[PDB]
């Protein structure tokens, strides 16, 4: 799963069979690392005109 953004600690709960959640419109919002099996949070860095 390839994507760009900043990674932070997340308190959301995955069931032991999911791998990565989303919120709406199919935009990834939380990913669990394959190694330490920890749920993170994804937010892209700000852009502006």
């Amino acid at each position: 799963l390839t994507g760009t953004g900043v990674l932070t600690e997340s308190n959301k709960k995955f069931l032991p069979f999911q791998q990565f959640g989303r919120d709406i419109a199919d935009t990834t919002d939380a990913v669990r690392d394959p190694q330490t099996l920890e749920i993170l949070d994804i937010t892209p860095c700000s852009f502006g005109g």
Binding site: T27, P44, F47, G48, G49
Partner: protein, 36 residues
């Protein structure tokens, strides 16, 4: 966000309320005479 942004309105809700209150006090105390 995916390259799509929302911009804040120039007038915040507070000054909108201020306009409404000014209009309403004017129409109570003065009537219509403050419209000219």
């Amino acid at each position: 966000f995916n390259g799509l942004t929302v911009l804040p309105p120039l007038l915040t809700d507070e000054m909108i309320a201020q306009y409404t209150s000014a209009l309403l006090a004017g129409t109570i105390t003065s009537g219509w005479t403050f419209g000219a």
